[PDB]
């Protein structure tokens, strides 16, 4: 007689796993009645009802935009300026970043101690951020201190002192940063990508600028920069939260009186010095680094180009992923599936950068040296596949994810304020959610194929890589992988 099917240790363990499997065989329909794995395009214009965004253009061309939520206890108010490193010159490059460092260094009325002590007396926050085409200073304060924050912003923008000793002290802080450009290689790979893709254009320069420029920065250079660029028609004052439109507009009229009024316009500057894409690459070989990071980018679309919306959907189709994501092997993005299933990267991210007249569309990835060859094949395959095969399910799911992400990231007064300021600068208006969702919904599978055929298929690319990148495919291998010869 043979043993019963529990005596042997291996037989007993086989019974346990067989019982667990039978348990999974019979699902319960109470928990399978609403959720569905099939993506469906849904129209819910009713739920996207939002507070009105009031826009007022002042006599001098100054624009004041507010989003009123009087239920909130705090508010975010700030100035968004159409100025950046793109609008400087080769000799003046780096002044905008220098100005950001010196903008909180005291005015005629308030010293540096007076400025900081005033702000943290009310528990406020002062933020300054400058990019290639946009500069912003904003304050997060309580509801009662909106008027006080507006006074602070107007004073620093109009009556900054720029002491000689403070300029010299700040000259060394930035010079130290320019020699310590390390520890954040994401900001370095993209900086080199801009430098090589936008060669010999204003858009290829870095925000920091060259070390000789910061060494030559004086008081007059900073004053000339403000007088040239910080003009009434290039500035937008955006407030969100517990703010009343009338009170903000009245205070803006009172404070922002001595603006430059220089007739320089942002559309003429872009026209006279246009940005163009050049296929090229920069490879920073360093075998001591443990991980290799690279970015391959195509020429993208400008802000107001209607294909930019389709590029946002295409960016969601490629997706983003890192090792700490739990379900990378099951997401709808095929590129993420290939990376997560075969473990050929530490992180991957598709980016879509828009500018006034051009843009960048590409993929940034971090991986070990021995994964670079298979990773490069996977990235180029899935990017090129967008011009050949696009499923309706994939494009619908990316449409659903793009809608959700654009509204779920608008949480807080500060994100709303920057959405108001950024849109008023790039589009000249705040695009209502309903219109934005209607443009996203117009991007179907045929639209994706047409846009990919225009930007991706048989197009030159820009690569910026750093680290142990000896096994990264060369330019000709990437260039060849932009089309399929079987079609």
């Amino acid at each position: 007689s043979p043993p019963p099917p529990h005596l042997m240790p291996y037989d007993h363990a086989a019974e346990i796993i067989k019982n667990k499997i039978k348990k999974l065989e019979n699902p319960d329909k109470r928990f399978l009645k609403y959720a569905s794995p099939h993506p469906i395009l849904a129209s819910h214009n009713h739920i996207l009802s939002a507070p009105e965004t009031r826009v007022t253009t002042l006599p001098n061309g100054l624009r004041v935009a507010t989003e009123s939520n009087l239920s909130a206890k705090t508010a975010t108010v700030g100035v968004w300026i159409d100025a950046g490193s793109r609008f400087e010159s080769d000799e003046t490059n780096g002044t905008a970043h220098f100005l950001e460092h010196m903008i909180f260094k005291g005015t005629d009325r308030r010293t540096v101690r007076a400025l900081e002590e005033e702000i943290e007396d009310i528990g406020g926050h002062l933020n300054a951020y400058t990019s290639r085409e946009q500069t912003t200073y904003y304050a997060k304060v309580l509801d009662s201190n909106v008027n006080q924050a507006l006074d602070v912003l107007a004073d620093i923008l109009q009556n900054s002192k720029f002491e000689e000793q403070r300029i010299n002290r700040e000259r060394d802080v930035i010079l130290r940063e320019m020699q310590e450009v390390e520890g954040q290689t994401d900001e370095v790979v993209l900086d080199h990508l801009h430098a090589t893709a936008f060669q010999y254009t204003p858009l290829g320069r870095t925000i920091l600028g060259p070390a000789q420029n910061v060494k030559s920065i004086t008081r007059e250079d900073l004053q000339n920069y403000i007088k040239t660029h910080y003009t009434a028609s290039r500035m937008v004052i955006a407030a969100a939260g517990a703010v009343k439109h009338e009170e903000v507009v009245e205070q803006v009229k009172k404070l922002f009186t001595k603006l430059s009024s220089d007739p320089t316009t942002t559309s003429q500057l872009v026209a006279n010095e246009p940005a163009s894409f050049t296929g090229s690459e920069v490879r920073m070989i360093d075998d001591d680094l443990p991980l290799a990071q690279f970015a391959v980018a195509f020429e993208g679309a400008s802000w107001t180009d209607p294909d930019s919306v389709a590029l946002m959907v295409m960016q969601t189709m490629l997706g983003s992923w890192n090792k700490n994501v739990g379900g990378g092997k099951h997401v709808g993005s095929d590129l993420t599936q290939r990376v997560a299933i075969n473990e050929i990267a530490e992180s991957i991210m598709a980016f879509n950068t828009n500018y006034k007249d051009t843009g960048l569309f590409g993929v940034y990835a971090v991986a070990k040296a021995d994964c670079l060859d298979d990773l490069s094949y996977a990235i180029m395959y899935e990017v090129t596949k967008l011009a050949y095969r696009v499923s309706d399910a994939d494009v619908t799911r990316a449409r659903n994810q793009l809608k959700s992400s654009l509204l779920l990231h608008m949480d807080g007064t500060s994100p709303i304020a920057e959405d108001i300021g950024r849109q008023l600068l790039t589009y000249g208006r705040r695009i209502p959610t309903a219109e934005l969702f209607a443009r996203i919904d117009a991007v179907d599978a045929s639209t994706v194929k047409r846009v990919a055929n225009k930007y991706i298929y048989d197009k030159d690319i820009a690569i910026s890589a750093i680290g142990p990148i000896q096994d990264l495919p060369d330019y000709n291998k990437f260039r060849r992988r932009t089309y399929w010869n079987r079609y």
């Binding site: 050949y388 095969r389 079987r486 079609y487």
Partner: peptide, 28 residues
């Protein structure tokens, strides 16, 4: 619906090559 166009495109190439290697102009 591009696999079908791929097949039709390659069928034209196969026909074009066949008339090119074998040139049966004196037979048609």
């Amino acid at each position: 619906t591009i696999d079908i166009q791929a097949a039709a495109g390659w069928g034209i190439a196969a026909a074009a090559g066949a008339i090119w290697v074998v040139q049966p102009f004196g037979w048609i």
